[PDB]
mmCIF file of N, CA and C in Angstrom:
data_model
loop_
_atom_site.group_PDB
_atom_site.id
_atom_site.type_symbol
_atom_site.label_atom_id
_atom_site.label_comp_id
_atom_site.label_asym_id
_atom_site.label_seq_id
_atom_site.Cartn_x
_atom_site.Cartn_y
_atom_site.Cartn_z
ATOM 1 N N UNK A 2 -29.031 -12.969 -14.671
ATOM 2 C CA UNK A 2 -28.571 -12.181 -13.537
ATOM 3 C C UNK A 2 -27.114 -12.507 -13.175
ATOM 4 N N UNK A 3 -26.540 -10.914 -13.235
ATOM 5 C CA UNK A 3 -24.751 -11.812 -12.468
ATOM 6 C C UNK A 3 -23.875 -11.001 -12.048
ATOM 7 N N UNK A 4 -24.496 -9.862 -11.301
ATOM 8 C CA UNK A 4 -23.439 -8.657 -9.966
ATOM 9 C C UNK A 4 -22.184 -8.323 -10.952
ATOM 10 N N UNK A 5 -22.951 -7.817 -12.340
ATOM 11 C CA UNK A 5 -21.446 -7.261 -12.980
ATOM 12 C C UNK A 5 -20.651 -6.182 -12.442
ATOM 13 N N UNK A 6 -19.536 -4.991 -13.060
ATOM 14 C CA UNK A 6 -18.386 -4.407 -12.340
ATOM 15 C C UNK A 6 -19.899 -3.336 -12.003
ATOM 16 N N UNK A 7 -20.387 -2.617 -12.695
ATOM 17 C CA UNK A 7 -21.937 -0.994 -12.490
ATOM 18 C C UNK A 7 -22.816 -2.195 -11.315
ATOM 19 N N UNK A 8 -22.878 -3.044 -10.927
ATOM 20 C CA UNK A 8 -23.452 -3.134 -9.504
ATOM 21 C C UNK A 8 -22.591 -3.435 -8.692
ATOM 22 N N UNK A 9 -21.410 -3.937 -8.385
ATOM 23 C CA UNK A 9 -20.304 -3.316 -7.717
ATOM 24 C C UNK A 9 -19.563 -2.013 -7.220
ATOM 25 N N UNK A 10 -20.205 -1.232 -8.053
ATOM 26 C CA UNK A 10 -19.076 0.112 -8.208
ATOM 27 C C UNK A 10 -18.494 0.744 -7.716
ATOM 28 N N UNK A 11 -19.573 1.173 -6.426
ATOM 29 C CA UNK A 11 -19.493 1.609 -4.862
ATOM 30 C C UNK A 11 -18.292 0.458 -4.461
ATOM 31 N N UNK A 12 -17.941 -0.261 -4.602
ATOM 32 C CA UNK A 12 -17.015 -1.222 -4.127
ATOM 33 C C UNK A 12 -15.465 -0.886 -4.431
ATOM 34 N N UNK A 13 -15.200 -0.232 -5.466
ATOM 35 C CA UNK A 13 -14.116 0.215 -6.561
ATOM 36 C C UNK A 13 -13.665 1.494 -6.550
ATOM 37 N N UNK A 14 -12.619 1.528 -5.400
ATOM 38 C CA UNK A 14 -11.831 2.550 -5.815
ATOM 39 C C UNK A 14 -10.584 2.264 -6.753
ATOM 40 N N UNK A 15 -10.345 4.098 -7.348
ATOM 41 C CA UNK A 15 -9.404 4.062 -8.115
ATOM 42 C C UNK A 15 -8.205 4.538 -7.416
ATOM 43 N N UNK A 16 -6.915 4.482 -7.887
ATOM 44 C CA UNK A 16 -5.689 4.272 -6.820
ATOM 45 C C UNK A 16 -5.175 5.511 -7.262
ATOM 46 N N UNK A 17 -3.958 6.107 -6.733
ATOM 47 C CA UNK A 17 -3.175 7.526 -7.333
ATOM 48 C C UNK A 17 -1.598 7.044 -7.522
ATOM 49 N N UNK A 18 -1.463 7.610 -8.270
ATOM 50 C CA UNK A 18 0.430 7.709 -7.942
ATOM 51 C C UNK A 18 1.462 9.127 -8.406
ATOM 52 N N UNK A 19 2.446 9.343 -8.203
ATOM 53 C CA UNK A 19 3.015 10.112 -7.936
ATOM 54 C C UNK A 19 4.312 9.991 -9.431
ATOM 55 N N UNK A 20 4.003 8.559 -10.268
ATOM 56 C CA UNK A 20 5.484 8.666 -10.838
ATOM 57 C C UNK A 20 5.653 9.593 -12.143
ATOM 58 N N UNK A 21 4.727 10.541 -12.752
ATOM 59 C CA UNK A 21 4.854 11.410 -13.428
ATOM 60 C C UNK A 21 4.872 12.997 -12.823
ATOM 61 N N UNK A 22 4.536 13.356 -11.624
ATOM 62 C CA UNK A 22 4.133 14.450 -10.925
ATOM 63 C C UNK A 22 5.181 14.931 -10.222
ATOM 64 N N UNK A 23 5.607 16.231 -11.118
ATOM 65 C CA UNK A 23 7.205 17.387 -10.813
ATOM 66 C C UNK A 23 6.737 18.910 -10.479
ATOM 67 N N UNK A 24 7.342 19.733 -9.912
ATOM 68 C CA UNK A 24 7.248 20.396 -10.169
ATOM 69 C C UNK A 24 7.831 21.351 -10.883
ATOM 70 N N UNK A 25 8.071 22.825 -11.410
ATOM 71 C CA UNK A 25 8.735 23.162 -11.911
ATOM 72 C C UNK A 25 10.315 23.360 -11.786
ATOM 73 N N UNK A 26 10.880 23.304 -12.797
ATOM 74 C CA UNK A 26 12.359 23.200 -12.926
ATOM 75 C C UNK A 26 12.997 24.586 -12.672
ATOM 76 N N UNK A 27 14.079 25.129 -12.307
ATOM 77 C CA UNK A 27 14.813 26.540 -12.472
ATOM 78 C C UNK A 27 15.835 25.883 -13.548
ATOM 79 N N UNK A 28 15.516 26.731 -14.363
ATOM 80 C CA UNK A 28 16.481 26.542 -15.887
ATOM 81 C C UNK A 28 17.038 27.925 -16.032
ATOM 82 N N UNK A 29 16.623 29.030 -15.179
ATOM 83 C CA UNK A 29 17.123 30.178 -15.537
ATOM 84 C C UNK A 29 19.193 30.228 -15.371
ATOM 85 N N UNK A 30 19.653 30.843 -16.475
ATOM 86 C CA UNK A 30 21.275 30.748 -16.535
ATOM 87 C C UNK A 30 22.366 31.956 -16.106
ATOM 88 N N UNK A 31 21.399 32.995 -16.190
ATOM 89 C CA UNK A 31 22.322 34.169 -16.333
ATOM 90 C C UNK A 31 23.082 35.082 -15.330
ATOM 91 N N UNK A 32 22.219 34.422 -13.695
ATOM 92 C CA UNK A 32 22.700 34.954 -12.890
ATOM 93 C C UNK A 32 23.902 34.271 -11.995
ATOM 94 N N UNK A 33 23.847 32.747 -12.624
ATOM 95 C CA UNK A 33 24.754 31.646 -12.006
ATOM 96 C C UNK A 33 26.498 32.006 -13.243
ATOM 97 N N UNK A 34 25.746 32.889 -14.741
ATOM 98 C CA UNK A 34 26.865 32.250 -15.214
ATOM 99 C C UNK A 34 28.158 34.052 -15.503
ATOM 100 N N UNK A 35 27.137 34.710 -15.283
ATOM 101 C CA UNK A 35 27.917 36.650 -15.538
ATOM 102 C C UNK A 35 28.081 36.928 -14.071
ATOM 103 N N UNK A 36 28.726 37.735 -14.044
ATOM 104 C CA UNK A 36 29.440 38.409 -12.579
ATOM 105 C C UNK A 36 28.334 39.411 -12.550
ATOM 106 N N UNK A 37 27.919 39.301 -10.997
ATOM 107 C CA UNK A 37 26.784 40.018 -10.138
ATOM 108 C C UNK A 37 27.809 41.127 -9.788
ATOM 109 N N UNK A 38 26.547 42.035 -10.066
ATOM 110 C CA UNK A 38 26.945 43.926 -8.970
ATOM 111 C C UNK A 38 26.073 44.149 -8.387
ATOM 112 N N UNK A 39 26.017 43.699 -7.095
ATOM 113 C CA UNK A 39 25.015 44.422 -5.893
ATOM 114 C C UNK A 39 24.776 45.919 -5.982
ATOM 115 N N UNK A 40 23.883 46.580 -6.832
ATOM 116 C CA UNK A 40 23.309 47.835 -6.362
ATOM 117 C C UNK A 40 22.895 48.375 -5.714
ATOM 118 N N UNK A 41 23.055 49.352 -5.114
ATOM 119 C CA UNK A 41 22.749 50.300 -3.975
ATOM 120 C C UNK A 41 21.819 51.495 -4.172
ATOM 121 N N UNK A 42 21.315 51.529 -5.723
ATOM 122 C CA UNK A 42 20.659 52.480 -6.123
ATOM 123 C C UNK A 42 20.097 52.306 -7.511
ATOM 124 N N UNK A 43 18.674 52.976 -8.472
ATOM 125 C CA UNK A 43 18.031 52.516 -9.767
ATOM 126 C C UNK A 43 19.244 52.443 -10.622
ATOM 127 N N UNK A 44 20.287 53.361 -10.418
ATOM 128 C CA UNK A 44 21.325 53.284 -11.806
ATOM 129 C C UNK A 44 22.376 53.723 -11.350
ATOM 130 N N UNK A 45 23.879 53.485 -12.400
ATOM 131 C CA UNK A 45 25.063 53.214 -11.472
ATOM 132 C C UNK A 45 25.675 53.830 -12.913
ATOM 133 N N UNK A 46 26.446 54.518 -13.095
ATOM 134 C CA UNK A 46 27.581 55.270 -13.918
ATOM 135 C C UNK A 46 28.468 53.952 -14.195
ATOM 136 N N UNK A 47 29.025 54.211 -15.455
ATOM 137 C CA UNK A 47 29.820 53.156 -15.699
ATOM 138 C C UNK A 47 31.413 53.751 -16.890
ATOM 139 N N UNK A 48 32.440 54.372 -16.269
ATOM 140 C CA UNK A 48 32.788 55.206 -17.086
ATOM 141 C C UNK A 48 33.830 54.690 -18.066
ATOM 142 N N UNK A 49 34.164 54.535 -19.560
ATOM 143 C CA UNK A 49 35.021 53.594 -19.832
ATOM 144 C C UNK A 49 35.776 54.745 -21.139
ATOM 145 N N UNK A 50 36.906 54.509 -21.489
ATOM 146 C CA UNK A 50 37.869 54.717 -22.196
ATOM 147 C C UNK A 50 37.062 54.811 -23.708
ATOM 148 N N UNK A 51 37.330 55.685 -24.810
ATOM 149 C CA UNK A 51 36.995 55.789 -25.875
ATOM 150 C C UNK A 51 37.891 55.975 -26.833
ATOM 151 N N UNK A 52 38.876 56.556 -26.709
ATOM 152 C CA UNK A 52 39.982 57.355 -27.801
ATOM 153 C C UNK A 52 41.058 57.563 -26.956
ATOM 154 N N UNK A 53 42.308 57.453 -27.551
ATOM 155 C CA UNK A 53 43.716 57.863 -27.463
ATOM 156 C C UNK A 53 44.346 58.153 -28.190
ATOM 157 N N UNK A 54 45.376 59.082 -28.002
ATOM 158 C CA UNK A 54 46.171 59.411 -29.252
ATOM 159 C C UNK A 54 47.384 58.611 -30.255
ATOM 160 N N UNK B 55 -32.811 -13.867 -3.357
ATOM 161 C CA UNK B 55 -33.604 -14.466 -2.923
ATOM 162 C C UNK B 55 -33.436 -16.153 -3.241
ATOM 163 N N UNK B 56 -33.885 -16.957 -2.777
ATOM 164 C CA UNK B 56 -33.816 -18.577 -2.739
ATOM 165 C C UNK B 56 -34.843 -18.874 -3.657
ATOM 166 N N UNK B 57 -35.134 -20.134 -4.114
ATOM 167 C CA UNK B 57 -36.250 -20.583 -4.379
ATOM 168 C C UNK B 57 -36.653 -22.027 -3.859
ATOM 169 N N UNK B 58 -37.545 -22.655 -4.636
ATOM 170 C CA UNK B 58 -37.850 -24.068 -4.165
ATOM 171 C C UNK B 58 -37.892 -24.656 -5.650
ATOM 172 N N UNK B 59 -37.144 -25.988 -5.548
ATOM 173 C CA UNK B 59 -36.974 -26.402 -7.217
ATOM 174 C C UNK B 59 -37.305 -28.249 -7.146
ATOM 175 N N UNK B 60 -37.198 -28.414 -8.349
ATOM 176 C CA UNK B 60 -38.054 -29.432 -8.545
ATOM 177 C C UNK B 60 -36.413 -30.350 -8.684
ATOM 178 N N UNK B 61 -36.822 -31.265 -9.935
ATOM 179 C CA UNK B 61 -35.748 -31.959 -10.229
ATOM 180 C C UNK B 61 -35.659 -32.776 -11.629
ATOM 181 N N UNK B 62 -36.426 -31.990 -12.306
ATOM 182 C CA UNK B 62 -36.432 -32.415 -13.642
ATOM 183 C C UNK B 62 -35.233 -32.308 -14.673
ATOM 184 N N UNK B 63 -34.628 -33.019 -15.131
ATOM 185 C CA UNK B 63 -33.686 -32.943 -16.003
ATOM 186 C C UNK B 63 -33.739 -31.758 -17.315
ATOM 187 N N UNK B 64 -35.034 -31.672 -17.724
ATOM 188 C CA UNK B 64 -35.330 -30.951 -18.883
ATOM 189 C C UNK B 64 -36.725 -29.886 -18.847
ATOM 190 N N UNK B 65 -37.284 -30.089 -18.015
ATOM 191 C CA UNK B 65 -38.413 -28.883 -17.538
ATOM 192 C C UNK B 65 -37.666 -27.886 -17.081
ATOM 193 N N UNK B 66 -38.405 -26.802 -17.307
ATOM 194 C CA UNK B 66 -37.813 -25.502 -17.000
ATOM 195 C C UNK B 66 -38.098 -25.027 -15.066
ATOM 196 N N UNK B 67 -38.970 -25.622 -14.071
ATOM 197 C CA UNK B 67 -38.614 -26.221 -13.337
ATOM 198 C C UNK B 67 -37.566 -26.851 -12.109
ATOM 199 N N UNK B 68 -36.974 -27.759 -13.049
ATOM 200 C CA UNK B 68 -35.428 -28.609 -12.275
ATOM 201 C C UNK B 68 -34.462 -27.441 -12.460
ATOM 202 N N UNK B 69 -34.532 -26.181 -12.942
ATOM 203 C CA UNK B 69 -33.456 -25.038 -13.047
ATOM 204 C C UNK B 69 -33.351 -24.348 -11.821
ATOM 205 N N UNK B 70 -31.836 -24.161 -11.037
ATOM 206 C CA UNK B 70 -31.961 -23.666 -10.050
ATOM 207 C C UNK B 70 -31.332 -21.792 -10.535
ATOM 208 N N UNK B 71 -32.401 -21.056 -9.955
ATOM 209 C CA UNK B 71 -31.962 -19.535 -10.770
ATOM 210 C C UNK B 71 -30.896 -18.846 -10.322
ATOM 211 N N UNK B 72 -30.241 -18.172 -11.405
ATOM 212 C CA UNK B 72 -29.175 -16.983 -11.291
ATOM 213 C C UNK B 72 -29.837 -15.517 -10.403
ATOM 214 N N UNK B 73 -29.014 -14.889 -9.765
ATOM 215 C CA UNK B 73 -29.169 -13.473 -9.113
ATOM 216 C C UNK B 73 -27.887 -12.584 -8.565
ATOM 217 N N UNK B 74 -28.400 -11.340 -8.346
ATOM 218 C CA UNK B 74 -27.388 -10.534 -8.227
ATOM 219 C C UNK B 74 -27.866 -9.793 -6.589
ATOM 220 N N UNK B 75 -26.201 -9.607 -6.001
ATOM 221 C CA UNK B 75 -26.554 -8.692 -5.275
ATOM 222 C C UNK B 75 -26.211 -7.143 -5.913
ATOM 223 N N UNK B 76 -26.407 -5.708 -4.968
ATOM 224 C CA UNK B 76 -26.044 -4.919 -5.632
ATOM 225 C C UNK B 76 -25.801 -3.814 -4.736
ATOM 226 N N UNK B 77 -24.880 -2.954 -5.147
ATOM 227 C CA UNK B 77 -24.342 -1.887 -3.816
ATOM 228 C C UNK B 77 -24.732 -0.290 -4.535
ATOM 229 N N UNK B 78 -24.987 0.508 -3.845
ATOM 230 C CA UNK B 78 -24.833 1.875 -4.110
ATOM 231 C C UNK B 78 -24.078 3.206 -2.957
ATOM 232 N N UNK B 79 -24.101 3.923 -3.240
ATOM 233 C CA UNK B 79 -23.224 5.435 -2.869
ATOM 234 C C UNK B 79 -23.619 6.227 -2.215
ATOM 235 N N UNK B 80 -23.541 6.841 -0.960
ATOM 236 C CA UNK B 80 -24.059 7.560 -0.529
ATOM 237 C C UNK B 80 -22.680 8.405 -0.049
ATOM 238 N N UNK B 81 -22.675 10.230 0.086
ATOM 239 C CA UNK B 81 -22.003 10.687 0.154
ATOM 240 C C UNK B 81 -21.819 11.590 1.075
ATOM 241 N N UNK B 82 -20.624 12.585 1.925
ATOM 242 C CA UNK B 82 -20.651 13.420 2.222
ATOM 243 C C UNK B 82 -19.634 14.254 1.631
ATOM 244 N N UNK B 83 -20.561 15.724 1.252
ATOM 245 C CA UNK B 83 -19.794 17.120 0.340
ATOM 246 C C UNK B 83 -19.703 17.997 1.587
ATOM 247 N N UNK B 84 -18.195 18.919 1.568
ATOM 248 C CA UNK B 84 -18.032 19.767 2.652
ATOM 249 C C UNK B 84 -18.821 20.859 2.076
ATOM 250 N N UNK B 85 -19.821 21.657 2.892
ATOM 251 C CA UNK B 85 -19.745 23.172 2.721
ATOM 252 C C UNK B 85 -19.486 24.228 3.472
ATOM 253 N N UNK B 86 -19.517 25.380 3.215
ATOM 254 C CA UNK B 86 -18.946 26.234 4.025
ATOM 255 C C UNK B 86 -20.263 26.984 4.448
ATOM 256 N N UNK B 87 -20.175 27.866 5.536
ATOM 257 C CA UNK B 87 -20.907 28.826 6.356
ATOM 258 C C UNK B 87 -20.552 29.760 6.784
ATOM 259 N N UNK B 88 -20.419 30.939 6.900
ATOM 260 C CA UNK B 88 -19.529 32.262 7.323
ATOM 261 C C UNK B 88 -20.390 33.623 7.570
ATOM 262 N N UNK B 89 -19.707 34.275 8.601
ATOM 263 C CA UNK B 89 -20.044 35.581 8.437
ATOM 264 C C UNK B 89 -18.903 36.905 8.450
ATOM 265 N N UNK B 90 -19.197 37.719 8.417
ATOM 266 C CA UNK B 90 -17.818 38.927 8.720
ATOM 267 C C UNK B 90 -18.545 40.151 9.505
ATOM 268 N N UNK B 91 -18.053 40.507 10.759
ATOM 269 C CA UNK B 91 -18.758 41.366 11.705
ATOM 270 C C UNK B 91 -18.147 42.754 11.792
ATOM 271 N N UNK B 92 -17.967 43.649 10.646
ATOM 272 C CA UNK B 92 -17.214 44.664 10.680
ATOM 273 C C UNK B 92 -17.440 46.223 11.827
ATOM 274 N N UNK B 93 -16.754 46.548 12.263
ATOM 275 C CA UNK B 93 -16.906 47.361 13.750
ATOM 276 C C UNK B 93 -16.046 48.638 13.411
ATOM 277 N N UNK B 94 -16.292 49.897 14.015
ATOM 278 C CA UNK B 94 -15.603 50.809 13.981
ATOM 279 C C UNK B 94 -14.334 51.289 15.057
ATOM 280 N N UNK B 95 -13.215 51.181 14.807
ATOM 281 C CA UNK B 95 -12.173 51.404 16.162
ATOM 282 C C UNK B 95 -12.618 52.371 16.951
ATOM 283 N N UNK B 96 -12.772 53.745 16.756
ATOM 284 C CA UNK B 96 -13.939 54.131 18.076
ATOM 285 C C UNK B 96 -14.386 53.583 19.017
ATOM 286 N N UNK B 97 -15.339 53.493 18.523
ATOM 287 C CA UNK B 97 -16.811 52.673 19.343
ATOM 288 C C UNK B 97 -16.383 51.191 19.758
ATOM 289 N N UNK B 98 -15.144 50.651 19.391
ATOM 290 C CA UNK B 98 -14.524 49.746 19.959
ATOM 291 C C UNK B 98 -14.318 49.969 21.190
ATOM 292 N N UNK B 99 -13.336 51.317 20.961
ATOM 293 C CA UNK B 99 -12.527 51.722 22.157
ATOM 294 C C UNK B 99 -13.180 52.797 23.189
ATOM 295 N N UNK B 100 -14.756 53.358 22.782
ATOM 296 C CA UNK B 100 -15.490 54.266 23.770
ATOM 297 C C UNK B 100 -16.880 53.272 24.946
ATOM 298 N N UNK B 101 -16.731 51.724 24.057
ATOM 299 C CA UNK B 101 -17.578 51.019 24.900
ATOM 300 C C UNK B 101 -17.397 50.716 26.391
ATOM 301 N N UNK B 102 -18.055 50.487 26.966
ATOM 302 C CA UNK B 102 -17.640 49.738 28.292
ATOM 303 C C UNK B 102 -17.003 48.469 28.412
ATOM 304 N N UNK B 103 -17.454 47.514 27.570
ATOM 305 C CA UNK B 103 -17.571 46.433 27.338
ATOM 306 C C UNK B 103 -16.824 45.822 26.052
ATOM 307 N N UNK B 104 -16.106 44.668 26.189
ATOM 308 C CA UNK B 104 -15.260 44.197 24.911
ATOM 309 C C UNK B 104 -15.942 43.859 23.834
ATOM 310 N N UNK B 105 -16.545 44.622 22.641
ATOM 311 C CA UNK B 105 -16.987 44.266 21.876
ATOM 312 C C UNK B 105 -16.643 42.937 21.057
ATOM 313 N N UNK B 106 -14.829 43.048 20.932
ATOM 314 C CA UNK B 106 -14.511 42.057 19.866
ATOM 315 C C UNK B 106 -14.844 40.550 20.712
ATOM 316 N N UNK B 107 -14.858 40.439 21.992
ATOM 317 C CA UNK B 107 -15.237 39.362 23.025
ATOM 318 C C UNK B 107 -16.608 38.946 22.753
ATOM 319 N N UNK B 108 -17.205 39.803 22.522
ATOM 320 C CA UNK B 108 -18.833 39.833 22.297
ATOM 321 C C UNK B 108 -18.994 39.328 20.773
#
């Protein structure tokens, strides 16, 4: 006979920690790194040069 | 538990015995209970009386 850790057990908690636990990252690039156009509407004309003489 | 022992060097006897104590678990689990009392705005508003109070 000898009160091993399974007749203790009820006695034994297990502990938590925090040093692996992140949440997600913003990795997105494209709006920090191209020039923004605030739209005012679904679609916007964009008129550009093709040919000269 | 205790016992009562002798004092023999080599009889089985003069041995004073091994024992264990021992613990177990008892628990409390949350559950839930609910209802939903759905009413018609009408008959809300043609009663005498505050239904949604009621």
């Amino acid at each position: 006979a000898d009160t091993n850790r399974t007749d203790a057990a009820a006695l034994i908690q297990e502990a938590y920690s925090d040093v692996f636990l992140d949440s997600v990252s913003e990795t997105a690039k494209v709006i920090g790194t191209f020039p923004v156009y605030n739209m005012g509407t679904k679609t916007t004309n964009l008129p550009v040069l093709s040919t000269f003489p | 538990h205790a016992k009562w022992v002798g004092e023999s060097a080599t009889a089985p006897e003069g041995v004073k015995p091994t024992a264990k104590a021992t613990w177990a678990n008892k628990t409390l689990v949350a559950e839930e209970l609910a209802v939903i009392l759905p009413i018609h705005e009408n008959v809300l508003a043609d009663a005498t009386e505050d239904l949604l109070a009621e």
